[model samples]
Target: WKQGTEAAAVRSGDKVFFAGDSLMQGVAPFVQKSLKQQYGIESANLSKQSTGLSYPSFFDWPKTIEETLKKHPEISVLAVFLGPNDPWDFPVGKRYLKFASDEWAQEYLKRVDRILEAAHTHRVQVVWLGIPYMKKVKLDGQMRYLDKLLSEHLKGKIILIPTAQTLSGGKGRYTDSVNKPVRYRSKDGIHFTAEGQKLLAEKIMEKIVFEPSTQPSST
Candidate 1:
Protein backbone atom coordinates (compact mmCIF):
# COMPACT_ATOMS: atom_id res chain seq x y z
CA TRP A 1 0.00 0.00 0.00
CA LYS A 2 1.06 3.55 -0.74
CA GLN A 3 1.50 6.18 1.94
CA GLY A 4 -0.76 9.22 2.14
CA THR A 5 -0.52 12.82 3.34
CA GLU A 6 -1.71 12.05 6.88
CA ALA A 7 0.91 9.32 7.27
CA ALA A 8 3.53 12.04 6.70
CA ALA A 9 2.63 13.60 10.07
CA VAL A 10 4.26 10.57 11.71
CA ARG A 11 8.03 10.53 11.35
CA SER A 12 9.75 7.50 9.87
CA GLY A 13 10.95 6.19 13.22
CA ASP A 14 7.81 6.92 15.20
CA LYS A 15 5.70 4.04 16.53
CA VAL A 16 1.97 3.44 17.10
CA PHE A 17 0.72 1.93 20.37
CA PHE A 18 -2.49 -0.08 20.57
CA ALA A 19 -3.92 0.12 24.10
CA GLY A 20 -7.10 -1.41 25.55
CA ASP A 21 -8.72 -4.62 26.86
CA SER A 22 -8.82 -8.12 25.43
CA LEU A 23 -10.61 -7.00 22.25
CA MET A 24 -7.57 -4.91 21.47
CA GLN A 25 -5.34 -7.81 22.45
CA GLY A 26 -7.06 -9.89 19.78
CA VAL A 27 -6.68 -7.31 17.02
CA ALA A 28 -3.49 -5.35 17.77
CA PRO A 29 -1.05 -7.98 16.51
CA PHE A 30 -2.79 -8.18 13.18
CA VAL A 31 -2.66 -4.40 13.02
CA GLN A 32 1.00 -4.32 14.03
CA LYS A 33 1.95 -6.96 11.47
CA SER A 34 0.04 -5.29 8.67
CA LEU A 35 1.63 -1.93 9.40
CA LYS A 36 5.11 -3.42 9.44
CA GLN A 37 4.66 -5.48 6.30
CA GLN A 38 2.60 -3.09 4.18
CA TYR A 39 3.91 0.40 4.88
CA GLY A 40 6.89 -0.34 7.13
CA ILE A 41 5.15 1.38 10.03
CA GLU A 42 6.11 0.32 13.55
CA SER A 43 3.47 -0.54 16.16
CA ALA A 44 3.15 -2.03 19.65
CA ASN A 45 0.35 -4.15 21.04
CA LEU A 46 -0.03 -2.81 24.59
CA SER A 47 -3.45 -4.32 25.24
CA LYS A 48 -4.22 -6.30 28.41
CA GLN A 49 -6.82 -9.01 28.79
CA SER A 50 -9.80 -8.51 31.20
CA THR A 51 -8.70 -4.93 31.97
CA GLY A 52 -10.64 -1.72 31.41
CA LEU A 53 -11.28 1.87 32.49
CA SER A 54 -14.18 0.99 34.80
CA TYR A 55 -12.30 -1.45 37.05
CA PRO A 56 -8.97 -0.01 38.21
CA SER A 57 -8.62 -2.58 40.98
CA PHE A 58 -8.27 -5.12 38.20
CA PHE A 59 -6.06 -2.83 36.09
CA ASP A 60 -5.74 0.94 36.18
CA TRP A 61 -5.54 2.09 32.54
CA PRO A 62 -4.60 5.71 33.23
CA LYS A 63 -1.60 4.85 35.35
CA THR A 64 -0.59 2.08 32.99
CA ILE A 65 -0.96 4.41 30.01
CA GLU A 66 1.02 7.15 31.72
CA GLU A 67 3.87 4.75 32.44
CA THR A 68 3.70 3.37 28.93
CA LEU A 69 3.96 6.82 27.40
CA LYS A 70 6.87 7.68 29.66
CA LYS A 71 8.61 4.46 28.65
CA HIS A 72 7.87 4.73 24.93
CA PRO A 73 8.25 8.39 24.09
CA GLU A 74 8.55 7.39 20.45
CA ILE A 75 4.81 6.63 20.30
CA SER A 76 3.13 9.08 17.95
CA VAL A 77 -0.27 7.41 17.70
CA LEU A 78 -2.45 5.72 20.35
CA ALA A 79 -5.13 3.28 19.28
CA VAL A 80 -7.63 2.19 21.93
CA PHE A 81 -10.61 -0.23 22.30
CA LEU A 82 -11.68 -0.68 25.93
CA GLY A 83 -15.30 -1.50 26.72
CA PRO A 84 -15.80 -5.28 26.88
CA ASN A 85 -15.28 -5.49 30.63
CA ASP A 86 -16.92 -2.19 31.55
CA PRO A 87 -20.57 -3.17 31.90
CA TRP A 88 -20.37 -3.99 35.62
CA ASP A 89 -20.84 -1.61 38.54
CA PHE A 90 -17.98 0.71 39.53
CA PRO A 91 -17.08 0.49 43.18
CA VAL A 92 -16.29 3.62 45.17
CA GLY A 93 -15.29 3.37 48.81
CA LYS A 94 -18.16 1.46 50.52
CA ARG A 95 -20.73 2.14 47.80
CA TYR A 96 -20.97 0.96 44.19
CA LEU A 97 -22.04 3.04 41.24
CA LYS A 98 -24.87 1.29 39.41
CA PHE A 99 -24.35 0.34 35.77
CA ALA A 100 -25.82 2.55 32.96
CA SER A 101 -26.83 5.28 35.35
CA ASP A 102 -25.95 8.94 34.84
CA GLU A 103 -23.37 8.64 37.59
CA TRP A 104 -21.88 5.61 35.98
CA ALA A 105 -21.63 7.38 32.62
CA GLN A 106 -20.04 10.42 34.19
CA GLU A 107 -17.49 8.38 36.14
CA TYR A 108 -16.58 6.34 33.09
CA LEU A 109 -16.21 9.56 31.12
CA LYS A 110 -13.80 10.83 33.75
CA ARG A 111 -11.46 7.88 33.21
CA VAL A 112 -11.73 8.20 29.44
CA ASP A 113 -11.02 11.91 29.66
CA ARG A 114 -7.98 11.24 31.79
CA ILE A 115 -6.62 8.83 29.21
CA LEU A 116 -7.23 11.31 26.39
CA GLU A 117 -5.72 14.15 28.37
CA ALA A 118 -2.61 12.09 29.02
CA ALA A 119 -2.23 11.40 25.32
CA HIS A 120 -2.84 15.03 24.50
CA THR A 121 -0.23 16.13 27.03
CA HIS A 122 2.31 14.01 25.17
CA ARG A 123 1.10 15.26 21.75
CA VAL A 124 0.02 11.80 20.67
CA GLN A 125 -2.74 11.33 18.11
CA VAL A 126 -5.56 9.05 19.28
CA VAL A 127 -7.59 6.53 17.31
CA TRP A 128 -10.44 4.99 19.30
CA LEU A 129 -11.96 1.85 17.82
CA GLY A 130 -15.62 1.46 18.84
CA ILE A 131 -16.85 -1.77 20.42
CA PRO A 132 -18.63 -3.96 17.88
CA TYR A 133 -21.95 -5.84 18.28
CA MET A 134 -21.94 -8.90 20.52
CA LYS A 135 -23.96 -12.15 20.44
CA LYS A 136 -25.60 -11.41 23.77
CA VAL A 137 -28.27 -8.73 23.76
CA LYS A 138 -27.54 -7.48 27.27
CA LEU A 139 -23.84 -7.11 26.58
CA ASP A 140 -24.41 -5.58 23.15
CA GLY A 141 -26.80 -3.06 24.69
CA GLN A 142 -24.11 -1.95 27.11
CA MET A 143 -21.54 -1.82 24.35
CA ARG A 144 -23.76 0.40 22.24
CA TYR A 145 -24.27 2.79 25.14
CA LEU A 146 -20.55 3.06 25.81
CA ASP A 147 -19.86 3.43 22.10
CA LYS A 148 -22.32 6.30 21.82
CA LEU A 149 -20.88 8.01 24.87
CA LEU A 150 -17.36 7.78 23.46
CA SER A 151 -18.41 8.97 20.02
CA GLU A 152 -20.11 11.98 21.55
CA HIS A 153 -17.28 12.77 23.93
CA LEU A 154 -14.30 12.44 21.63
CA LYS A 155 -15.66 14.11 18.51
CA GLY A 156 -12.87 16.38 17.22
CA LYS A 157 -10.33 15.43 19.86
CA ILE A 158 -9.47 12.15 18.12
CA ILE A 159 -10.39 9.87 15.26
CA LEU A 160 -13.06 7.37 16.30
CA ILE A 161 -13.48 4.28 14.13
CA PRO A 162 -17.13 3.16 14.21
CA THR A 163 -16.38 -0.55 14.27
CA ALA A 164 -19.87 -1.32 15.55
CA GLN A 165 -21.46 0.26 12.52
CA THR A 166 -18.82 -1.20 10.24
CA LEU A 167 -19.41 -4.71 11.51
CA SER A 168 -23.18 -4.54 11.84
CA GLY A 169 -25.62 -6.28 9.55
CA GLY A 170 -28.08 -3.40 9.92
CA LYS A 171 -28.90 -0.66 12.38
CA GLY A 172 -28.09 -1.94 15.86
CA ARG A 173 -27.42 -5.49 14.67
CA TYR A 174 -24.45 -7.87 14.97
CA THR A 175 -23.02 -9.64 11.97
CA ASP A 176 -20.74 -12.66 11.70
CA SER A 177 -20.53 -12.77 7.92
CA VAL A 178 -20.19 -10.20 5.18
CA ASN A 179 -20.88 -11.65 1.70
CA LYS A 180 -20.01 -15.23 2.65
CA PRO A 181 -19.82 -17.41 5.80
CA VAL A 182 -16.33 -16.27 6.78
CA ARG A 183 -17.21 -16.32 10.53
CA TYR A 184 -15.45 -13.08 11.26
CA ARG A 185 -16.18 -13.49 14.97
CA SER A 186 -15.45 -16.45 17.25
CA LYS A 187 -17.87 -18.87 18.96
CA ASP A 188 -18.09 -16.66 22.03
CA GLY A 189 -19.35 -13.98 19.61
CA ILE A 190 -17.47 -11.32 21.55
CA HIS A 191 -14.00 -11.61 20.04
CA PHE A 192 -12.75 -11.51 16.48
CA THR A 193 -11.38 -14.47 14.55
CA ALA A 194 -8.04 -14.35 12.71
CA GLU A 195 -9.71 -13.05 9.56
CA GLY A 196 -11.78 -10.60 11.60
CA GLN A 197 -8.61 -9.35 13.24
CA LYS A 198 -7.04 -8.67 9.86
CA LEU A 199 -10.13 -6.83 8.68
CA LEU A 200 -10.12 -4.63 11.78
CA ALA A 201 -6.42 -3.94 11.39
CA GLU A 202 -7.06 -2.73 7.89
CA LYS A 203 -9.74 -0.36 9.20
CA ILE A 204 -7.30 1.04 11.78
CA MET A 205 -4.69 1.49 9.07
CA GLU A 206 -7.10 3.49 6.93
CA LYS A 207 -7.65 5.94 9.80
CA ILE A 208 -3.92 6.13 10.63
CA VAL A 209 -3.33 6.81 6.97
CA PHE A 210 -6.27 9.29 7.37
CA GLU A 211 -7.47 8.84 3.84
CA PRO A 212 -11.08 7.89 3.30
CA SER A 213 -10.93 8.37 -0.43
CA THR A 214 -8.27 5.71 -0.89
CA GLN A 215 -10.12 3.03 1.08
CA PRO A 216 -12.73 0.70 -0.38
CA SER A 217 -16.38 1.68 0.08
CA SER A 218 -17.40 -1.67 1.66
CA THR A 219 -16.20 -3.95 4.55
Candidate 2:
Protein backbone atom coordinates (compact mmCIF):
# COMPACT_ATOMS: atom_id res chain seq x y z
CA TRP A 1 0.00 0.00 0.00
CA LYS A 2 1.08 3.63 -0.54
CA GLN A 3 0.25 4.63 3.04
CA GLY A 4 3.38 6.53 4.00
CA THR A 5 3.83 8.13 0.62
CA GLU A 6 0.19 8.99 0.20
CA ALA A 7 -0.40 11.24 3.20
CA ALA A 8 0.82 12.17 6.65
CA ALA A 9 -0.59 10.07 9.42
CA VAL A 10 -2.46 11.44 12.43
CA ARG A 11 -0.36 12.61 15.38
CA SER A 12 -2.31 10.71 17.99
CA GLY A 13 -2.92 7.01 17.97
CA ASP A 14 -6.67 7.18 18.65
CA LYS A 15 -7.62 10.83 18.29
CA VAL A 16 -6.80 14.51 18.19
CA PHE A 17 -9.06 17.00 19.98
CA PHE A 18 -11.25 19.86 18.73
CA ALA A 19 -12.02 22.30 21.54
CA GLY A 20 -14.05 25.50 21.64
CA ASP A 21 -17.56 26.92 21.74
CA SER A 22 -20.16 27.26 18.95
CA LEU A 23 -17.54 28.12 16.40
CA MET A 24 -15.74 24.87 17.17
CA GLN A 25 -18.79 22.67 17.74
CA GLY A 26 -20.33 23.91 14.51
CA VAL A 27 -17.23 23.19 12.49
CA ALA A 28 -16.17 19.90 14.12
CA PRO A 29 -17.65 17.40 11.69
CA PHE A 30 -16.64 19.41 8.66
CA VAL A 31 -13.12 19.71 10.04
CA GLN A 32 -12.99 16.01 10.88
CA LYS A 33 -14.08 15.09 7.38
CA SER A 34 -11.57 17.37 5.76
CA LEU A 35 -8.66 16.35 7.98
CA LYS A 36 -9.43 12.68 7.65
CA GLN A 37 -9.65 12.93 3.89
CA GLN A 38 -6.80 15.32 3.20
CA TYR A 39 -4.19 14.40 5.81
CA GLY A 40 -5.17 11.02 7.21
CA ILE A 41 -5.86 12.51 10.62
CA GLU A 42 -8.56 11.50 13.08
CA SER A 43 -10.35 13.85 15.49
CA ALA A 44 -12.92 14.01 18.24
CA ASN A 45 -15.20 16.97 18.94
CA LEU A 46 -14.93 18.05 22.56
CA SER A 47 -16.43 21.47 22.13
CA LYS A 48 -19.81 22.79 23.26
CA GLN A 49 -22.01 25.57 21.97
CA SER A 50 -22.49 28.70 24.10
CA THR A 51 -19.58 27.75 26.32
CA GLY A 52 -16.95 30.18 27.54
CA LEU A 53 -13.23 29.75 28.17
CA SER A 54 -13.86 28.95 31.82
CA TYR A 55 -17.08 26.98 31.36
CA PRO A 56 -18.29 24.18 29.12
CA SER A 57 -21.79 22.82 28.55
CA PHE A 58 -21.83 19.68 30.72
CA PHE A 59 -18.34 19.56 32.12
CA ASP A 60 -15.93 21.94 33.78
CA TRP A 61 -12.93 22.86 31.61
CA PRO A 62 -10.26 21.46 33.92
CA LYS A 63 -12.01 18.16 34.65
CA THR A 64 -12.83 17.59 31.03
CA ILE A 65 -9.27 18.03 29.88
CA GLU A 66 -7.94 16.06 32.83
CA GLU A 67 -10.20 13.11 32.12
CA THR A 68 -9.48 13.17 28.43
CA LEU A 69 -5.77 13.29 29.08
CA LYS A 70 -5.93 10.35 31.45
CA LYS A 71 -7.69 8.29 28.81
CA HIS A 72 -5.55 9.43 25.91
CA PRO A 73 -2.21 10.50 27.29
CA GLU A 74 -0.69 10.80 23.88
CA ILE A 75 -2.76 13.67 22.54
CA SER A 76 -0.61 15.55 20.08
CA VAL A 77 -2.50 18.65 19.20
CA LEU A 78 -5.29 20.72 20.71
CA ALA A 79 -7.36 23.03 18.49
CA VAL A 80 -8.96 25.64 20.70
CA PHE A 81 -11.27 28.61 20.11
CA LEU A 82 -12.59 30.46 23.12
CA GLY A 83 -13.02 33.96 24.61
CA PRO A 84 -16.19 35.26 22.95
CA ASN A 85 -18.13 34.92 26.19
CA ASP A 86 -16.38 36.88 28.91
CA PRO A 87 -17.41 40.30 30.19
CA TRP A 88 -15.47 42.24 32.77
CA ASP A 89 -16.57 41.67 36.35
CA PHE A 90 -15.42 42.68 39.81
CA PRO A 91 -15.29 40.28 42.70
CA VAL A 92 -17.45 41.05 45.69
CA GLY A 93 -17.62 39.29 49.10
CA LYS A 94 -18.96 36.07 47.54
CA ARG A 95 -19.92 36.87 43.99
CA TYR A 96 -18.90 38.56 40.77
CA LEU A 97 -20.04 42.16 40.60
CA LYS A 98 -20.46 44.41 37.64
CA PHE A 99 -20.38 41.76 34.94
CA ALA A 100 -20.28 44.44 32.26
CA SER A 101 -17.38 46.49 33.53
CA ASP A 102 -13.71 46.42 32.39
CA GLU A 103 -12.48 45.18 35.77
CA TRP A 104 -12.85 41.53 34.84
CA ALA A 105 -10.19 41.64 32.13
CA GLN A 106 -7.49 40.65 34.60
CA GLU A 107 -9.25 37.55 35.87
CA TYR A 108 -10.39 36.62 32.39
CA LEU A 109 -6.81 36.76 31.19
CA LYS A 110 -5.62 34.58 34.06
CA ARG A 111 -8.05 31.85 33.11
CA VAL A 112 -6.97 32.02 29.49
CA ASP A 113 -3.26 31.91 30.29
CA ARG A 114 -3.76 28.92 32.53
CA ILE A 115 -5.34 26.84 29.79
CA LEU A 116 -2.79 27.77 27.14
CA GLU A 117 0.07 27.09 29.51
CA ALA A 118 -1.45 23.77 30.51
CA ALA A 119 -1.56 22.67 26.91
CA HIS A 120 2.05 23.60 26.41
CA THR A 121 3.15 21.70 29.49
CA HIS A 122 1.29 18.62 28.30
CA ARG A 123 3.38 18.64 25.13
CA VAL A 124 0.42 19.39 22.94
CA GLN A 125 0.89 22.05 20.33
CA VAL A 126 -2.06 24.39 20.55
CA VAL A 127 -3.73 26.14 17.63
CA TRP A 128 -5.53 28.95 19.42
CA LEU A 129 -7.87 30.44 16.87
CA GLY A 130 -8.92 34.05 17.27
CA ILE A 131 -12.46 35.40 16.99
CA PRO A 132 -13.74 36.80 13.75
CA TYR A 133 -15.36 40.21 13.57
CA MET A 134 -18.72 40.36 15.29
CA LYS A 135 -22.12 41.31 13.88
CA LYS A 136 -22.72 44.05 16.40
CA VAL A 137 -20.38 46.91 15.70
CA LYS A 138 -20.81 48.31 19.18
CA LEU A 139 -19.58 45.12 20.81
CA ASP A 140 -16.56 44.99 18.54
CA GLY A 141 -14.45 47.32 20.64
CA GLN A 142 -14.66 45.23 23.80
CA MET A 143 -14.04 42.05 21.83
CA ARG A 144 -10.89 43.50 20.34
CA TYR A 145 -9.71 44.45 23.81
CA LEU A 146 -10.25 40.92 24.99
CA ASP A 147 -8.32 39.61 22.01
CA LYS A 148 -5.52 42.03 22.72
CA LEU A 149 -5.36 40.73 26.27
CA LEU A 150 -5.05 37.17 24.97
CA SER A 151 -2.44 37.94 22.34
CA GLU A 152 -0.33 39.99 24.66
CA HIS A 153 -0.24 37.19 27.21
CA LEU A 154 0.38 34.38 24.73
CA LYS A 155 3.65 35.97 23.65
CA GLY A 156 5.27 32.95 21.96
CA LYS A 157 3.86 29.57 22.95
CA ILE A 158 0.57 29.78 21.10
CA ILE A 159 0.03 30.10 17.38
CA LEU A 160 -2.52 32.82 16.75
CA ILE A 161 -4.56 32.66 13.57
CA PRO A 162 -6.38 35.92 12.97
CA THR A 163 -9.65 34.43 11.77
CA ALA A 164 -11.01 37.96 11.59
CA GLN A 165 -8.63 38.62 8.74
CA THR A 166 -9.43 35.33 7.08
CA LEU A 167 -13.18 35.78 7.33
CA SER A 168 -13.43 39.36 6.14
CA GLY A 169 -10.07 40.99 5.60
CA GLY A 170 -11.80 44.35 5.42
CA LYS A 171 -15.30 45.83 5.28
CA GLY A 172 -15.62 45.77 1.48
CA ARG A 173 -15.29 42.01 0.81
CA TYR A 174 -18.72 41.21 2.29
CA THR A 175 -21.22 43.68 3.73
CA ASP A 176 -22.82 41.40 6.30
CA SER A 177 -21.71 40.67 9.86
CA VAL A 178 -20.62 37.19 8.79
CA ASN A 179 -19.46 36.03 5.37
CA LYS A 180 -21.47 34.00 2.86
CA PRO A 181 -20.77 30.93 0.57
CA VAL A 182 -22.27 28.39 3.05
CA ARG A 183 -18.64 27.52 3.54
CA TYR A 184 -17.75 30.67 5.42
CA ARG A 185 -20.51 30.75 8.03
CA SER A 186 -23.66 28.88 8.96
CA LYS A 187 -27.10 30.28 8.18
CA ASP A 188 -27.52 31.43 11.78
CA GLY A 189 -24.68 33.84 11.02
CA ILE A 190 -22.15 32.99 13.77
CA HIS A 191 -20.38 29.73 12.90
CA PHE A 192 -18.17 28.56 10.11
CA THR A 193 -19.78 27.30 6.92
CA ALA A 194 -18.47 24.23 5.12
CA GLU A 195 -16.26 26.30 2.85
CA GLY A 196 -15.14 28.34 5.82
CA GLN A 197 -14.22 25.14 7.59
CA LYS A 198 -12.02 24.15 4.69
CA LEU A 199 -10.38 27.54 4.74
CA LEU A 200 -9.62 27.26 8.46
CA ALA A 201 -8.28 23.73 8.18
CA GLU A 202 -5.92 24.63 5.38
CA LYS A 203 -4.71 27.62 7.33
CA ILE A 204 -3.93 25.43 10.35
CA MET A 205 -2.17 22.91 8.17
CA GLU A 206 0.09 25.60 6.80
CA LYS A 207 1.25 26.77 10.24
CA ILE A 208 2.19 23.29 11.45
CA VAL A 209 5.54 21.85 10.57
CA PHE A 210 5.03 18.75 8.50
CA GLU A 211 7.78 16.29 7.81
CA PRO A 212 9.16 16.25 4.28
CA SER A 213 7.85 12.74 3.65
CA THR A 214 4.41 13.74 4.85
CA GLN A 215 4.13 16.55 2.34
CA PRO A 216 2.61 15.94 -1.08
CA SER A 217 5.24 15.01 -3.64
CA SER A 218 3.99 17.42 -6.27
CA THR A 219 1.78 19.98 -4.56
User: Which candidate should be chosen as best, given TM-score against the real structure?
Assistant: 1
lDDT of 2: 0.61
TM-score on alpha carbons, each prediction: 0.87, 0.75
Candidate topping lDDT: 1
Task: Provide the global lDDT of candidate 1 against the true structure.
Answer: 0.80
lDDT of 2 at 97: 50
For model 1, the stretches where C-alpha displacement exceeds 4 angstroms are 1-8, 93-95, 169-171, 210-219
User: Superposing every Cα of model 1 onto the true structure, what RMSD results?
Assistant: 6.2
In the range 2-80, model 2's lDDT, one tens digit per residue, is 1121122344243567787777776567667766776576777888766775333344565566567667766666677
| Pairs of colliding residues, candidate 2 | 89-104, 183-195, 183-196, 185-193
Model 2 lDDT-worst window of ten = 1-10
Clashes of 1: 0
lDDT values for all models: 0.80, 0.61
